[PDB]
């Protein structure tokens, strides 16, 4: 639900302004763009 | 584990002072300068040289971060690189220099030397316009020297006969004929700790191929692409009296959209009304001991 | 820059060596409670 | 597939002035409406 | 060292530059008089400077 | 006692020549000099 | 290297300085003509000079 596009931090401007800060809010919370994929969560859930 | 800590504490990072005096020279190679100017400032009260105000830096950052299209992927990388490079310097490490448009000294050239210039500019000789920038910092007792960074750019005068005749007529003293020098002083320059003036290639690429009036760079050499984002200069001769005084007025003109938000707005002189010559310098203040 | 090696690197190497020595001592003396406490503190410190 | 054809060519219909457009942009954004095909030219006047 | 009181060269300043100096000296700008002394020694082959 | 004498004889004190040319400049900052002067002498016959 | 015979710039000497030069050249002062040649090379990135 946080990977949707209408979140304020998912916009291009926010990502550009907060691409070098290592402790940004999205990075701190663990949810960000993740443009590649999200696989190992599925692997862990299925293994469990 | 004592040698490692000893080495770590022994080595530190120093700091070099903010540069003080900036000089500009425009000339024809092998001849006295056409336009010599210099600027020194107190950095807090002078207007010819001073730190960038936070509002201007914020506006420049916003203009740089909003310069992309929502279709092409590579523009995202260019904008990100430009913003990341700009974010490396705070508002204290960036300065603004405003050269006066008018020449500082009267043109000290002999009649025979001017005739020699006209002859050299006549038949087939390829002369190059030379533009030199120089930054010098205050003396530091640590190193018994005064750090000084200088850069010189040479631009050809082309082989077109009608252009050379116009330039010769302008140099002779005929009124109503300007001299146009493309690829002149850069709007943004970077001074390193020990090297020479290095261009901000990321901002140059953004200007070249990120604005709406894209600048064509198909038929150009590699050494010209980095120079393709420079601004043009126009030099006019004002004489007034008979002889013994000849003034050169230089005016800059940005390439592409002259009213784009990327460029820093210029100021007008308080004694004549002609616009200043703006140069934005990024200063590195770290040397590895 | 990043050419200079920071003091955090050497102090954390010293901490790692101290951890190695502590683990060796705990194994030698056969202390289960001490080993459990050491593991708990070490894992908390690692995550944080 | 039937929403891609609608969105990719009739994007101009998504430009309601104000009011309902705010929710209209939200629903368009959460439905993932865009021109997936790259051969065709994206509509130019709707940059903003 | 005995410097001659008279200036060595005629003052090479532009009229526009002089007007700019007068304007800068007029209202509120703090201008500082700058005096520079310079001593240079003969070249020594031991150090190439 | 050989390293001490070797170090003592290896290191000595040099001598730099008497300065030759002296220049003075009086100006307003950011402007051509108001008064520029320089003096070079033969040190035995000159008076400047 | 071929230097032009004519001087590059007009002679910037003060009247009083010229009179002082004439006076120094008059009675007994030994004045020496000084000729300087200077060669400079393009900047090289290897050595920052």
UniProtKB/Swiss-Prot annotation, chain A:
Give the location in the cell. Cell membrane
Identify the residue ranges that face the Cytoplasmic compartment according to the record.
4-34
Taxonomically, the superkingdom here is: Eukaryota
TM spans (from-to)? 35-48
Q: What happens when the gene is disrupted?
A: Reduced brood size due to defects in ovulation with incomplete constriction of the sheath cells impairing oocyte transit, an accumulation of ooplasm in the uterus as a result of 'crushed' oocytes, caused by incomplete opening of the spermathecal-uterine valve, which in wild-type allows the fertilized oocyte to be expelled into the uterus, and sperm navigation defects.
Known tissue expression: Expressed in the pharyngeal-intestinal and spermathecal-uterine valves and in multiple reproductive tissues including the germline, somatic oviduct, and spermatheca. During reproduction, it is expressed in sheath cells, sperm, both spermathecal valves and the spermathecal bag cells.
> Function, please?
Pore-forming subunit of a mechanosensitive non-specific cation channel. Generates currents characterized by a linear current-voltage relationship. Plays a role in reproduction by positively regulating inter-tissue signaling to promote oocyte maturation, ovulation and fertilization, and sperm navigation from and to the spermatheca. May play a role in regulating cytosolic and endoplasmic reticulum calcium ion release.
Protein family membership? Belongs to the PIEZO (TC 1.A.75) family.
| Other noteworthy facts | Piezo comes from the Greek 'piesi' meaning pressure.
Protein's recorded name: Piezo-type mechanosensitive ion channel component 1
Give the source species. Answer: Caenorhabditis elegans
Query: What gene name is listed for this protein?
Result: pezo-1
Please give the range of the full-length protein represented by this chain.
1673 to 1720 of 2442
From Swiss-Prot, chain C:
| Membrane-traversing stretches | 2-22, 36-48
Q: Where is this protein found?
A: Cell membrane
Function, in words = Pore-forming subunit of a mechanosensitive non-specific cation channel. Generates currents characterized by a linear current-voltage relationship. Plays a role in reproduction by positively regulating inter-tissue signaling to promote oocyte maturation, ovulation and fertilization, and sperm navigation from and to the spermatheca. May play a role in regulating cytosolic and endoplasmic reticulum calcium ion release.
Concerning its family, UniProt says:
Belongs to the PIEZO (TC 1.A.75) family.
The free-text tissue note of the record is: Expressed in the pharyngeal-intestinal and spermathecal-uterine valves and in multiple reproductive tissues including the germline, somatic oviduct, and spermatheca. During reproduction, it is expressed in sheath cells, sperm, both spermathecal valves and the spermathecal bag cells.
What's the miscellaneous note? Piezo comes from the Greek 'piesi' meaning pressure.
Organism whose genome encodes this protein: Caenorhabditis elegans
Topological domain (Extracellular) residues are: 23-35
Shown portion of the whole protein? 1866 to 1913 of 2442
Q: What happens when the gene is disrupted?
A: Reduced brood size due to defects in ovulation with incomplete constriction of the sheath cells impairing oocyte transit, an accumulation of ooplasm in the uterus as a result of 'crushed' oocytes, caused by incomplete opening of the spermathecal-uterine valve, which in wild-type allows the fertilized oocyte to be expelled into the uterus, and sperm navigation defects.
- Please state what the protein is called: Piezo-type mechanosensitive ion channel component 1
From Swiss-Prot, chain D:
- Domain of life, per lineage: Eukaryota
Coiled-coil ranges from the UniProt annotation: none
Q: Where in the cell is it found?
A: Cell membrane
Q: In which tissues is it expressed?
A: Expressed in the pharyngeal-intestinal and spermathecal-uterine valves and in multiple reproductive tissues including the germline, somatic oviduct, and spermatheca. During reproduction, it is expressed in sheath cells, sperm, both spermathecal valves and the spermathecal bag cells.
Q: Where are the transmembrane segments?
A: 1-14
**Residues on Extracellular side:** 15-48
Report, from the record, the phenotype seen after gene disruption.
Answer: Reduced brood size due to defects in ovulation with incomplete constriction of the sheath cells impairing oocyte transit, an accumulation of ooplasm in the uterus as a result of 'crushed' oocytes, caused by incomplete opening of the spermathecal-uterine valve, which in wild-type allows the fertilized oocyte to be expelled into the uterus, and sperm navigation defects.
Instruction: Look up the further comments and give them.
Output: Piezo comes from the Greek 'piesi' meaning pressure.
**Primary role:** Pore-forming subunit of a mechanosensitive non-specific cation channel. Generates currents characterized by a linear current-voltage relationship. Plays a role in reproduction by positively regulating inter-tissue signaling to promote oocyte maturation, ovulation and fertilization, and sperm navigation from and to the spermatheca. May play a role in regulating cytosolic and endoplasmic reticulum calcium ion release.
Family note = Belongs to the PIEZO (TC 1.A.75) family.
What name goes with this protein?
Piezo-type mechanosensitive ion channel component 1
Q: Quote the gene name from the UniProt entry.
A: pezo-1
Q: Which residues of the complete protein does this chain represent?
A: 1239 to 1286 of 2442
């Amino acid at each position: 639900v946080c990977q949707f596009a209408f979140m304020p931090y998912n916009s291009i401007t926010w990502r550009t302004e907060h691409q070098m800060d290592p402790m940004s809010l999205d990075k701190l919370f663990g949810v960000s763009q993740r443009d590649s994929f999200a696989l190992w969560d599925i692997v862990l859930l299925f293994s469990l | 584990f004592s040698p490692l800590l000893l080495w770590s504490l022994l080595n530190q990072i120093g700091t070099i002072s903010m540069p003080e005096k900036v000089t500009l020279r425009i000339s024809i190679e092998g001849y006295p300068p056409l336009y010599e100017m210099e600027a020194q400032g107190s950095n807090h009260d002078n207007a010819e040289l001073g730190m960038i105000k936070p509002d201007q830096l914020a506006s420049l950052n916003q203009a740089l971060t909003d310069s992309y299209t929502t279709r092409d992927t590579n523009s995202i990388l260019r904008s990100r690189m430009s913003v990341s490079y700009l974010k490396g310097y705070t508002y204290e490490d960036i300065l603004i220099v405003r050269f006066r448009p008018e020449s500082e000294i009267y043109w000290p050239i002999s009649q025979d030397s001017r005739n020699a210039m006209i002859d050299k500019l006549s038949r087939n000789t390829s002369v190059n316009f030379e533009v030199s920038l120089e930054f010098t910092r205050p003396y530091d007792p640590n190193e018994n020297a005064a750090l000084k960074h200088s850069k010189s750019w040479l631009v050809p005068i082309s082989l077109d006969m009608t252009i050379r005749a116009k330039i010769q007529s302008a140099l002779r003293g005929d009124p109503g004929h300007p001299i146009l020098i493309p690829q002149s002083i850069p709007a943004f320059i970077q001074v390193p700790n020990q090297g020479e003036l290095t261009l901000p290639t990321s901002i140059g690429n953004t200007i070249i191929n990120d604005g709406n009036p894209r600048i064509n760079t198909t038929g150009m050499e590699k050494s010209d692409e980095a120079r393709a984002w420079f601004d043009s200069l126009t030099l006019n001769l004002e004489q007034g009296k008979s002889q013994n005084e000849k003034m050169w007025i230089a005016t800059s003109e940005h390439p592409g959209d002259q009213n784009a938000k990327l460029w820093i707005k210029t100021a007008n002189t308080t004694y004549s009304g002609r616009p200043y010559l703006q140069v934005v310098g990024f200063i590195d203040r770290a040397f590895p001991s | 820059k990043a050419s200079r090696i920071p003091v955090t690197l050497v102090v954390m190497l010293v901490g790692m060596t101290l951890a190695i020595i502590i683990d060796r001592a705990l194994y030698l003396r056969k202390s289960v409670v001490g080993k459990l406490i050491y593991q708990v503190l070490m894992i908390a410190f690692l995550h944080i | 597939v039937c929403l891609q054809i609608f969105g990719c060519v009739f994007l101009s219909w998504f430009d309601q002035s104000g009011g309902w457009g705010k929710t209209l942009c939200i629903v368009r954004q959460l439905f993932s409406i865009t021109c997936v095909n790259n051969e065709c030219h994206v509509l130019k006047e709707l940059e903003d």
